[PDB]
């Protein structure tokens, strides 16, 4: 009567105290890059995806196409992992730094903390370090995405002081008994390529919308059939106060910048809480994939 | 590993005994607890348990009603579980007669506090409403205990009675005269961005359409006036950021034949409702559109 | 209600009226709710008085 | 009401020749659409030949295909097709039908076929003024482009000459996705493409109004000191024509970016119709793939 379980081993000589460190992480969701059956421990967590060169939201895009197992049982020489299926309930540990409550829509985010921190004593080897994805509720995830994206938008004008105080304002967030702070996406007054592609795509779709749409709705008024369409170009006239293959190229690049933004503008709720354990360390959630 | 292991017949749960029976039977003891039939083993519906103050559990002694947790910017009571009927004092869709009926049953302390908390923030409703699903039992204390149903059917213990989802008549809305073999149910919040009020209209749609684009293309065709109201308050009042004219989440699905009109009586207040007898709850996120 | 296509003047007329919520103007209907339809007729003119003695003269 | 039968038997009234039963045995564990959801359906309702019209409106076919219930073929035998409408969440194998190579980790969407007709010479169960029509199981970026080019061919064809239209269809019918060339059968402007154009243009007008004072000048400030092939390739599709930000007000920027995300999603859902299968592992000859998200 065994369940479908993916077995993961370890190649290093894991000591007894390190297993005892590992045994606390029972209901901790760990991603998997590829649904194998027996997998090495180098592909268990985000430390196969750690890149000092690349940014943060590239990891958010690469977390979408993972497989998010749960540590079913920890013992000697192999670790059990449980692939969840849609509809059955599972316990999840609060590996994220945010408190949870009954019925919150949970979403999975790459951890905004890494390396040296007073609570980042994690499962570590000589070169391997286990890092866990964050599990935060839905509106906090939306707000964090907006904060990091706006802080990426201020990457060029950082020399002024109003922008610096704005970065100090956006970098922190108050939540339910949370004085949480995020890291800044810029380091050493130059921006990483992930955030640069994100803000470039957003600025491009905003600029192309500000360029094409007046001409298109002005062309649409000849074949106008709804009063919703004539009044929308009126506000374009209010706000404002070529080769055809290039026009096709402009529309195509607009849709390319639209396609390169779905990793930011939406996210799927993964868990929702049925019950939270007392002291908020764990909770019981149904799956929703 | 051999031929007989794969050639073994599949396992049925009711044929084999429970865990506790074969645990006690080995060491040869018998206790006063009867363990030969263990309840709630064959219960596919995922459920939970939530507390609620007494001020909200009117129109709730009947089993089967929607339950949406609403947000609250405080710290201690910061989450509160309100029924759909108590949200009826906020919908502009509700007529005056039904509103004066159901506001005359929530004349307690905490009901008006949730009424004020809905109309005190800078945000909309669907940025403060989170659906939990449907109840199936009460407990009726001074702090009543409810059992909500998260995913699956609604039934009693021992499955002897199928509870039915109730929705009031004003929020009901169909867009076809010929219902299919199935029709899903959706929860529609559509905002009226008119001058003195942004008080939305709450609707529960029972449609046979499944794919979401093929739902929103008729959602625009049924709520065009509110779209014009949204763009009108956008062009009229700049330096304001309106958003999400209509928000739709999938509530669940039904059988498209047991849907009939009924009523609930409570404190001799007859309220005409729509009764969905075999409703299976399948919650979804508040998907937003324009 | 006065009217100059026939030089016909109508004196004792009652009108139910309220605001259009989509805008800020007035909507004038009958007690049945006819949505009183002389305003589109180009020849008539109406005088409106309210119970608080507000005055209106509508071309 | 009786429950929706997970075991759907399709029957056959034509005299099946032996090659027809042979070709019917090839299509085990494939996708077929059916709108009826009865237990003993006939063969006329099975497939997509009930909706192929003389219009050849491919956008109309995409509009109707989203409402059809997708099932899986199983246990083909004499005059019996046992179909299985799959419950959401579990996994079972599907099989490709078109020449579309897949990957692992991507997603799959349903689609009416491309260059459909006697060009590839499909003898897929032809009997008595009826053909078995198969929806394509195509991956994610192909399903993105196959509606992006649809909407662009809709939007360009307003107020312009017909020779521009005939020069624009041939520039936007080929798709060179993953070592293969596909052609779309007759992209034709209809009322459905019109209402899709109306939704698209309204959303992009509203997001053009919704743009803040900084996000429209980000590339304008960036392109003075930056040099990259990405920035150069995106700059030339714009017109030609230190400083200070006007007023930093991030309390307004959160609301602007939130409603801008809503407008971007409202533009996005015109080409991102439905994920219907997430492929986990393929066969090495790519004839099939075990995948999840069935239903």
UniProtKB/TrEMBL annotation, chain A:
GO terms for molecular function: structural molecule activity. GO terms for cellular component: viral capsid. Keywords: Capsid protein, Host nucleus, Virion. HAMAP family: HSV_TRX2. This is Capsid triplex subunit 2. It comes from Human cytomegalovirus (HHV-5).
TrEMBL record, chain B:
Pfam families: Herpes_VP19C (PF03327). GO terms for molecular function: DNA binding. GO terms for biological process: viral capsid assembly. It comes from the Viruses. GO terms for cellular component: viral capsid. Coiled coil: none annotated. Keywords: Capsid protein, Host nucleus, Virion. InterPro entries: Herpes_1. This is Capsid triplex subunit 1. The lineage of its organism: Viruses, Duplodnaviria, Heunggongvirae, Peploviricota, Herviviricetes. The gene is UL46.
Automatic annotation (TrEMBL), chain D:
It comes from the Viruses. Keywords: Capsid protein, Host nucleus, Virion. One of its GO terms (cellular component) is viral capsid. InterPro entries: Herpes_capsid_2. Pfam families: Herpes_V23. One of its GO terms (molecular function) is structural molecule activity. This is Capsid triplex subunit 2. The gene is UL85.
